[PDB]
Design a protein around this ligand. Structure first.
Ligand SMILES: CC[C@H](C)[C@@H]1NC(=O)[C@@H](NC[C@@H](O)[C@H](Cc2ccccc2)NC(=O)OC(C)(C)C)Cc2ccc(cc2)OCCCNC1=O
Lengths: 99, 99
């Protein structure tokens, strides 16, 4: 689809067999999801954004369906205000910025 | 133009007479520029991102040219590692997400 920016670009995603709302964030290198139980092994990791660094659990090669489009990649789970779909998954579904 | 997301979508902006590199961020409600001495009246405010909140100064009606596209709106100045162009200015240059 073509998504305008008058509102936050929120879409539904399916991850771990569960549906959630996530923000398509081109300013995010990675995908950060709110705390949840995800099947698979995880490595502790630290990432930083505007207000600082947080600790996250890194899950690799996790299938994520974004608006019906499939991606299989790394997702970080940790304390976040909102589910963020970053560049690592946006590139898999062929998302581009246009103006 | 069409910007792919293989790399951070960084473009040149012009603000306050200066040229800077800034990240096009669809996940940002506001525009945050790195600490600069912009003249004008400002109001204090706190914005949060991943990790927490930072104090910034809010300037209104600031002319910003993005990739040769003119826009004008609120710009927050504060200690950010990178300049961030948020939706408040992206909508003005007709930017859309497409996949
Ligand atoms: C500072 C930008 C803007 C103010 C802020 N947006 C944001 O910070 C959104 N984009 C994240 C991007 O703005 C930053 C840019 C950056 C890059 C490198 C170093 C530092 C910062 N990237 C970023 O945080 O990448 C992570 C998620 C992988 C850690 C993600 C988000 C959305 C809503 C959030 C919290 C976070 O909570 C909602 C509150 C509204 N906050 C916002 O809209």
């Amino acid at each position: 689809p073509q998504i305008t920016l008058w509102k936050r670009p929120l879409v539904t995603i399916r991850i771990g067999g569960q549906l959630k709302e996530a923000l398509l964030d081109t300013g995010a290198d990675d995908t950060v999801i709110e705390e949840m139980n995800l099947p698979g092994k995880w490595k502790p990791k630290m990432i930083g954004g505007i207000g600082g660094f947080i600790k996250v659990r890194q899950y690799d090669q996790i299938p994520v369906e974004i608006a019906g489009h499939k991606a299989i990649g790394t997702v970080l789970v940790g304390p976040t205000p909102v589910n963020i779909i970053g560049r690592n998954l946006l590139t898999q579904i062929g998302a581009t910025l246009n103006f």
